[PDB]
Amino acid sequence: KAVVPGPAEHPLQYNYTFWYSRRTPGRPTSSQSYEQNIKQIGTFASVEQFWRFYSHMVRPGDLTGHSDFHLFKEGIKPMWEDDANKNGGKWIIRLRKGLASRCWENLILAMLGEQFMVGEEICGAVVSVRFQEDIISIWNKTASDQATTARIRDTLRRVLNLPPNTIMEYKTHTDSIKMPGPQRLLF
């Protein structure tokens, strides 16, 4: 079962797993329910194995519904509850429609190619497709590590071509957990 690079393939620093989820906004969501709505697509160990999945995948810009792709180090679930994520957080970038597919490709290539240079800190990346915008996120292990979170922010600026006036926001997962005019109906 264990995934290894093939004979002539180019090995990665880590194995990674693609995940996919589709839901609706505003669901009363426990740990167990969240985990049931996310599914593993495939795991890879080499650059060539990456492209075998990625070249055959729907681009996030072409997904319908309230849907997400997650690409995380093998053994890390894309959930706050995972031991690797419990003390962590994420940089988020919000994008108008039409930009997510290119941004996602740049993000995951930078991640896989070890462009962040924060040791073991990266957990994974998410692209979230929503009603009138898309969101791209990168998760790391230790939210309190200011050197790490700053290095990640700067790397995103370096590898992504963002519209002028693009806000980046850092959210600790513990802040996310405890976060609450009209109710938000379409997202």
């Binding site: 060539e48 075998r52 290539l109 070890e114 462009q115």
Partner: peptide
């Protein structure tokens, strides 16, 4: 650490 630049990664797209 195993590091790859973007260009190298893209170049691998056309090999199995």
């Amino acid at each position: 650490r195993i590091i790859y630049d973007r260009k190298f990664l893209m170049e691998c797209r056309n090999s199995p």
